From a paper:
The space group of the [name]-F crystal is P21, with two molecules in the asymmetric unit. The two monomers are identical in terms of the overall fold with well-ordered electron density throughout both chains. The final model contains 262 residues, and includes all 131 residues for each [name]-F molecule. The [name] monomer is composed of two structurally distinct domains connected by a flexible linker and resembles a human leg: the [name]-N, composed of residues 1–67, is the ‘foot’ and ‘calf’ and the [name]-C, composed of residues 69–131, is the ‘thigh’. The ‘knee’-like linker connecting the domains, centered on residue 68, is flexible, allowing the N- and C-terminal domains to rotate independently of one another as rigid bodies (superposition of the N- and C-terminal domains from chains A and B give RMSD values of 0.35 Å and 0.58 Å, respectively). [name] dimerization is mediated by the [name]-C HTH-XRE domain. Six residues are buried upon dimer formation, including Ser112, Lys115, Leu116, Val119, Leu126 and Ile130.
Our biochemical and structural analysis of the [name] [name] antitoxin and the [name]:[name]-N complex provide a detailed 3-dimensional structural view of the free antitoxin and the TA complex. In addition, [name] associates with [name] to form a tight, non-toxic complex and both [name] alone and the [name]:MqsA2:[name] complex bind and regulate the [name] promoter.
Residue numbers in the entry:
A (entry chain A): 0 to 131
B (entry chain B): 1 to 131
């Protein structure tokens, strides 16, 4: 019987839980996480091994988001390579009104498909007619 | 003639740009001839004027509607790329169950995913660039 050291009310019981996690505007569920969990406030306590498993999953998610994400500077370059204004690019690639104005200030993440479309248009500027 | 809606304004012949929203998409219908109330902007359009107006309304509805892709088309492109739905979901985005719902018609892909799938339908080899 260990009492939760955060809420000081509930009991910590060992279990396996799926943990929601958001990083750089991307969401995931960290699946099958072993640890002690407070029945009252859901605070988690992980031993050395459990923490290793958890952090490997967290860091694999971060690595993948970072590799997929593109710099504001890349977005501008691809847009300028296509001689598009921010408004035309938002319309052509997607994202809504002011999408590219926000993307280029580093103030928003494009949808994964917008990023990928940008990556393809970077290498294939001739495809612009197919998407406009 | 007095305006038949507000009863406190004269209807005058003119031309106006009329904003119009359809399925949450906004446009301005340009150069619409009609009688317009000076007070409340109620419009009265004769047959000929209504046909012109409705032809713009309908051309805008049709282009908005046509942005949607047949779920059949989504299956066509996916099979074509030798991808499962789990993989497509991971590649194109939308979430864990994305592509299963698209092909049942229970969800619409993001506009960029549609564009990316239309591009890939014509040039399926480019997947290897963004996989
Ligand atoms: Zn607690
Ligand atoms: Zn009136």
């Amino acid at each position: 019987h260990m009492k939760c050291p955060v809420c000081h009310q509930g009991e910590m019981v060992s279990g396996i839980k799926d943990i929601p996690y958001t990083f750089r505007g991307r969401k995931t569920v960290l699946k099958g996480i072993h640890g002690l969990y407070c029945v009252h406030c859901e605070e988690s306590i992980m031993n050395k091994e459990e923490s290793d498993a958890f952090m490997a999953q967290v860091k694999a998610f971060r690595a993948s988001v970072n590799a997929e994400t593109v710099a504001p500077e890349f977005i501008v370059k691809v847009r300028k390579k296509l001689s598009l204004t921010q408004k035309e690019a938002s319309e052509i690639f997607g994202g809504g009104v002011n999408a590219f104005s926000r993307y280029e200030k580093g103030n928003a993440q494009p949808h994964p498909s917008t990023i990928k479309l940008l990556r393809v248009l970077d290498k294939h500027p001739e495809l612009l007619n197919e998407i406009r």
